[PDB]
Amino acid sequence: KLKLFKKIGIGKFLHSAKKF
DSSP: OOOGGGGGTSHHHHHHHHOO
16 A cells, blocks of 8 residues: 555655745
């Protein structure tokens, strides 16, 4: 199976890069 639950935790990571 998979842990898509992280699909919602990979935000701050993608964000920090959205501006830096």
